[PDB]
A paper describes a structure:
We present in this report the structure of MpPR-1i, a SCP/TAPS protein expressed by M. perniciosa during biotrophic stage of WBD, in basidiomes, and in monokaryotic mycelia. MpPR-1 proteins are homologues of plant pathogenesis–related-1 (PR-1) proteins that were first identified over a century ago as important for defense against fungi and parasites. PR-1 proteins are members of the eukaryotic CAP (cysteine-rich secretory protein/antigen 5/pathogenesis related-1) or SCP/TAPS (Sperm-coating protein/Tpx/antigen 5/pathogenesis related-1/Sc7) superfamily of proteins, which has been implicated in biological processes like reproduction, fungal virulence, cellular defense, and immune evasion. Each monomer of MpPR-1i has a conserved alpha-beta-alpha sandwich topology made up of 3 β strands sandwiched between two helical domains, connected by loops.
The structure was refined and extended to higher resolution, using a 2.43 Å native data set. There are seven monomers in the asymmetric unit, which form a pseudo seven fold screw axis when viewed along the diagonal of the cell. The MpPR-1i crystal has very high solvent content, ~70%, which is clearly demonstrated by the solvent channel in the crystal packing viewed along a cell dimension. The main chains of the MpPR-1i monomers are very similar with rmsd ranging between 0.19 Å to 0.27 Å. The most variable regions between the monomers are loop regions, notably the solvent exposed loop connecting the two longest β-stands, as well as the N- and C-termini loops. MpPR-1i forms a unique crystallographic heptamer, which likely does not have any functional relevance as MpPR-1i forms monomers in solution. MpPR-1i, like SmVAL4, lacks the tetrad that binds divalent cations in other SCP/TAPS proteins. This explains why MpPR-1i does not bind Zn2+ used in the crystallization solution. Structural comparisons with tablysin-15, a palmitate binding CAP protein, showed that MpPR-1i has a similar cavity sufficiently large and open to accommodate palmitate or similar lipids. The shortened length of the CBM loop significantly reduces the size of the sterol binding cavity, rendering it barely large enough to accommodate dioxane and definitely too small to accommodate cholesterol.
Numbering used by the authors: 31 to 164
The structure:
């Protein structure tokens, strides 16, 4: 029960609204990332996911609906440029060109299931100066 076309659209809109406000170039969807995202998402592990590749940690992860998950990431803007803002940094980085997101439905024993959301970014986040470079 899944509409891929609308799924890409919603995620792109969330990301690109945030960036458009801030005079940034929009991100384009990349399926490879979206696939990677799903791989991570499927594990049902927010804290300790098993990752692979050079850009393996270049991603955001969050619980519940898309809007809620995205907001929890952008909510960290407050403390930029410290490490707590890294989530928001991924979204807003000037160097960033591509995103791909993926989900999975995970359970709490004898409780309502919840969604796990993951988005991957390319190129990966670097140092403070590089991220704002064009």
């Amino acid at each position: 029960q899944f509409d891929p076309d609308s799924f890409k659209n919603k995620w792109l809109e969330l990301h690109n609204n945030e960036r458009t406000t801030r005079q940034l170039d929009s991100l384009e969807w990349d399926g490879d990332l979206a696939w990677k995202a799903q791989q991570v998402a499927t594990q049902c592990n927010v804290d300790n996911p098993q990752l692979w590749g050079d850009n393996g940690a270049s991603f955001n992860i969050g619980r519940y609906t898309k809007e809620q998950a995205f907001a929890e990431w952008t909510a960290t803007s407050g403390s930029f440029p410290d490490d707590r803002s890294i989530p928001w940094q991924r979204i807003v980085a000037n160097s960033a060109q591509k995103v791909g997101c993926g989900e999975a439905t995970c359970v709490l024993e004898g409780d309502m299931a919840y969604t796990v959301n993951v988005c991957y970014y390319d190129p990966p986040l670097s140092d403070y100066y590089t991220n704002a470079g064009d």
